[PDB]
Amino acid sequence: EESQAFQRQLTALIGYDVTDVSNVHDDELEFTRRGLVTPRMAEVASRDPKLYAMHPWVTSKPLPEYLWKKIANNCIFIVIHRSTTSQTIKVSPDDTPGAILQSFFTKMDFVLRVCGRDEYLVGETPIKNFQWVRHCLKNGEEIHVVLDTPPDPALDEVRKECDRKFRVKIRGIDIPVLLTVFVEANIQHGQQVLCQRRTSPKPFTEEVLWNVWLEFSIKIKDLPKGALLNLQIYCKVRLLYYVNLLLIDHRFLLRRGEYVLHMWQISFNADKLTSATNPDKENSMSISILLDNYCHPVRAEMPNQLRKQLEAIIATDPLNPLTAEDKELLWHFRYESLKHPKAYPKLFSSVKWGQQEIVAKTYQLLARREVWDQSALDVGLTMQLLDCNFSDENVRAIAVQKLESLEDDDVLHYLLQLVQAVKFEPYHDSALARFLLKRGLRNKRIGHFLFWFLRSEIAQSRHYQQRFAVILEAYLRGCGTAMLHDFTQQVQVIEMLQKVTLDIKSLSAEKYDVSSQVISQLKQKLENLQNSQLPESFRVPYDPGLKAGALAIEKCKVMASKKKPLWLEFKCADPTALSNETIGIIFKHGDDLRQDMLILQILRIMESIWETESLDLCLLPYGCISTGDKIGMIEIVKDATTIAKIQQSTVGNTGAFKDEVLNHWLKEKSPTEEKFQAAVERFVYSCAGYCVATFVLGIGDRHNDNIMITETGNLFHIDFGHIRVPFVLTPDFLFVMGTSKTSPHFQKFQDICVKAYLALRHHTNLLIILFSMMLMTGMPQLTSKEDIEYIRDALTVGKNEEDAKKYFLDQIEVCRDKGWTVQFNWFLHLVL
Numbered sequence: 001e002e003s004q005a006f007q008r009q010l011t012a013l014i015g016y017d018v019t020d021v022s023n024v025h026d027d028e029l030e031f032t033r034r035g036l037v038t039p040r041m042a043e044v045a046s047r048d049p050k051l052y053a054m055h056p057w058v059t060s061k062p063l064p065e066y067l068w069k070k071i072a073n074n075c076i077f078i079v080i081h082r083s084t085t086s087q088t089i090k091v092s093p094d095d096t097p098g099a100i101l102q103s104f105f106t107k108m109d110f111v112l113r114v115c116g117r118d119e120y121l122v123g124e125t126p127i128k129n130f131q132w133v134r135h136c137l138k139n140g141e142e143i144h145v146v147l148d149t150p151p152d153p154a155l156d157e158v159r160k161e162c163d164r165k166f167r168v169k170i171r172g173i174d175i176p177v178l179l180t181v182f183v184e185a186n187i188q189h190g191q192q193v194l195c196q197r198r199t200s201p202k203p204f205t206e207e208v209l210w211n212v213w214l215e216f217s218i219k220i221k222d223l224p225k226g227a228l229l230n231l232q233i234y235c236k237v238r239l240l241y242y243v244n245l246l247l248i249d250h251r252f253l254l255r256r257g258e259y260v261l262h263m264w265q266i267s268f269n270a271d272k273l274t275s276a277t278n279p280d281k282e283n284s285m286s287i288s289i290l291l292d293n294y295c296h297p298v299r300a301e302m303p304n305q306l307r308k309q310l311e312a313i314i315a316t317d318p319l320n321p322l323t324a325e326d327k328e329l330l331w332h333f334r335y336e337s338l339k340h341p342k343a344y345p346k347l348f349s350s351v352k353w354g355q356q357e358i359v360a361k362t363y364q365l366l367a368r369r370e371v372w373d374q375s376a377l378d379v380g381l382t383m384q385l386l387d388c389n390f391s392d393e394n395v396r397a398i399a400v401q402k403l404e405s406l407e408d409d410d411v412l413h414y415l416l417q418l419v420q421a422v423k424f425e426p427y428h429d430s431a432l433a434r435f436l437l438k439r440g441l442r443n444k445r446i447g448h449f450l451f452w453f454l455r456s457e458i459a460q461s462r463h464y465q466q467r468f469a470v471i472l473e474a475y476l477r478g479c480g481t482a483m484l485h486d487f488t489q490q491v492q493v494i495e496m497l498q499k500v501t502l503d504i505k506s507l508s509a510e511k512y513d514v515s516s517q518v519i520s521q522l523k524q525k526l527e528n529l530q531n532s533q534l535p536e537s538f539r540v541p542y543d544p545g546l547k548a549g550a551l552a553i554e555k556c557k558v559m560a561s562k563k564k565p566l567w568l569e570f571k572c573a574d575p576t577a578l579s580n581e582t583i584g585i586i587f588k589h590g591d592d593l594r595q596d597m598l599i600l601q602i603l604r605i606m607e608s609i610w611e612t613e614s615l616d617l618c619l620l621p622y623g624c625i626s627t628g629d630k631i632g633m634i635e636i637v638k639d640a641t642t643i644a645k646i647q648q649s650t651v652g653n654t655g656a657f658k659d660e661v662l663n664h665w666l667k668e669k670s671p672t673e674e675k676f677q678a679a680v681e682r683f684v685y686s687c688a689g690y691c692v693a694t695f696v697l698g699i700g701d702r703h704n705d706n707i708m709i710t711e712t713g714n715l716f717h718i719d720f721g722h723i724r725v726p727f728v729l730t731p732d733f734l735f736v737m738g739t740s741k742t743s744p745h746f747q748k749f750q751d752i753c754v755k756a757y758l759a760l761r762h763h764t765n766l767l768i769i770l771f772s773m774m775l776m777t778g779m780p781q782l783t784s785k786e787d788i789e790y791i792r793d794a795l796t797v798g799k800n801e802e803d804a805k806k807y808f809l810d811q812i813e814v815c816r817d818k819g820w821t822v823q824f825n826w827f828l829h830l831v832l
């Protein structure tokens with residue numbers, strides 16, 4: 001009974017039971033579980049036991065100019081410790097950890113490990129290329145390391161185990177409880193409706209029947225792999241219910257027989273694409289159908305003017321619509337289009353997918369992919385082939401092929417969007433799902449995040465938990481025994497804190513002030529938790545290098561906000577840690593943290609864009625992971641406060657705002673004038689960073705209670721769930737900058753803003769694809785073409801840089817012209 005016990009262990013880890021068949025009409029999930037064995041085993045056998053155990057976090061990107069500034073000597077200072085003794089050593093930027101190790105004995109079995117972190121500076125890499133080294137250089141910190149024995153790879157031990165038209169009979173529809181109603185049947189492939197048929201409208205009663213065959217113009221031989229039968233109910237004509245059925249199964253068989261499909265009720269989006277059925281069989285709407293159908297499935301140069309029209313089509317942004325003329329030209333000139341990697345999304349949208357001979361021709365075109373294979377990886381371009389507009393296996397596989405060249409550093413930037421893009425896959429087993437599994441199995445940091453990202457979707461997505469649960473098991477069956485124990489300890493702690501979060505929430509109203517009553521109750525529930533249930537220690541989910549110990553209960557509190565988040569603090573479970581600082585984690589219910597995750601990740605990507613142009617915009621995209629429905633954890637950036645709180649420390653709970661208050665607060669919060677000048681510099685940069693980022697994302701218009709600042713001048717926006725001024729640049733921000741006109745700080749700010757804004761515009765398409773993907777996968781509501789179009793207008797598409805500069809400076813002027821108006825209107829709306 002060891003085998004069942006291990007499965008029982010995996011089930012608690014996943015947050016779902018993969019061995020359950022309650023909501024299946026086929027064996028695709030069992031087939032995927034078997035399908036994923038070999039990809040996992042091939043990777044486990046390939047991984048370096050030593051490098052896997054120490055997981056160096058490295059990049060092959062050049063040191064940015066802004067970071068070379070701190071090395072104007074060509075020397076890097078590393079503090080090598082051993083108990084009370086610690087010696088500073090002079091190192092070259094090109095020096096490898098082994099070279100630093102040898103020269104250490106020259107001055108005075110072992111490996112260098114960061115103080116208070118499961119972070120190792122090891123392998124054939126210049127130290128300047130380790131992330132922690134670059135983290136320290138950016139935040140002027142000393143590079144403190146420890147001399148210790150490497151971890152034992154034995155801990156990572158892996159446990160050994162037909163020419164006729166298509167038709168569908170719509171029998172009827174049934175709901176036990178809930179007007180006119182009708183059914184719409186769609187043959188879909190890439191959100192594209194190849195064929196549509198409707199039934200007659202009828203009164204909406206608990207059981208509505210038709211028994212009418214809906215014959216489609218398309219032949220059974222012409223149905224492409226990944227084609228969906230989309231069944232929708234309409235009740236003003238509003239969509240009310242949907243469900244999908246993959247017409248061709250995982251084994252390439254045409255779907256046959258009677259189907260009783262439990263439908264999703266509407267509350268456009270990735271949830272609308274799911275082939276999963278609503279698991280609630282007692283209350284949901286049902287659709288009964290019958291599938292009868294039987295089957296088993298030297299060029300001429302372009303003229304000067306046509307080539308001009310073709311290139312113009314390829315130059316347009318990703319959300320530019322294709323005319324039938326555009327599609328015809330892209331298709332007729334297939335072979336010329338092939339020489340332009342940027343044409344691939346537009347060219348693949350020109351393929352007549354519901355024609356077997358065209359598909360065959362598309363596959364013919366792909367067989368000779370020298371130009372694609374040789375192209376410089378373009379993540380923006382590659383992500384476009386992994387969205388909702390492409391169901392083709394072969395087209396999606398060529399995009400995955402390009403992601404194979406991404407280094408760990410880059411996989412981490414895109415991991416979240418790549419886990420989400422799995423929602424766009426017609427089948428559970430895919431090249432993308434196999435790529436995600438492989439990379440997670442290859443690297444401990446990717447794997448850690450892959451665990452939490454899948455777990456987040458498994459906990460709350462009825463539409464995708466089944467598929468996502470199968471991928472997580474596949475990752476859990478090869479990560480190793482140490483990681484399996486690691487995850488079990490994080491899961492136990494989060495499970496235990498989620499319950500405490502909910503019970504406290506169930507003791508306090510919306511904004512009804514936090515009293516000693518609920519505070520006593522928190523410290524009581526935490527005491528019972530710690531004494532028995534709380535394990536030894538655990539890795540911090542949004543910071544796997546950090547290890548949290550015992551709860552500092554005396555420091556734990558209930559925050560005064562509508563939602564009642566827990567403020568928790570833990571001792572670092574690592575003796576070698578230089579600081580005597582606790583780990584602060586917020587546990588919250590009430591906000592959809594999935595949206596925040598997506599926003600926070602786009603910010604880290606925006607930081608990476610600015611880095612490739614030697615810019616540091618001082619963003620603070622704090623750790624955040626969604627653990628369930630409206631619940632999750634937030635990294636406490638200690639010694640920070642809300643902009644509204646600074647205003648209320650002087651004038652109280654009034655919209656009556658003052659300008660000098662933030663500047664007063666910063667000077668008052670500074671230990672020396674040197675540090676105060678540094679803080680104004682940090683403010684100018686971080687303000688600019690957030691003004692460009694939030695403007696680009698259409699999340700600029702915000703209430704100051706959702707804008708925070710550190711005692712070190714670092715501004716940072718918070719609470720991104722469920723979201724006039726283009727951005728926040730109020731009189732108090734301007735006063736810190738020396739204006740109330742112009743200023744050397746205000747002019748520096750305008751310059752930083754312009755530089756950052758044009759740096760983002762050089763990655764317009766990448767930003768368009770990440771944004772649309774986010775709107776499609778993160779928002780529970782259905783998305784329109786309008787919502788997606790915002791970012792195109794904000795990125796001043798088809799505009800010169802001088803015009804773009806002119807544009808961003810006008811946005812800065814609107815914030816000056818509006819002053820405190822919008823902030824005051826937010827206070828009247830939200831505070832009252």
Ligand SMILES: NS(=O)(=O)c1ccc(Nc2nccc(-c3cccc(C(=O)N4CCCCC4)c3)n2)cc1
Pocket residue numbers: 559560561565586588622634635636637638639640641642645718719
């Ligand atoms: N002095 S204080 O206002 O209690 C305070 C609050 C938070 C932090 N540190 C931090 N560092 C990163 C992200 C977030 C953060 C992000 C999103 C939401 C919240 C939040 O739930 N509150 C509600 C209560 C007031 C503030 C916002 C906090 N906080 C530091 C101090």
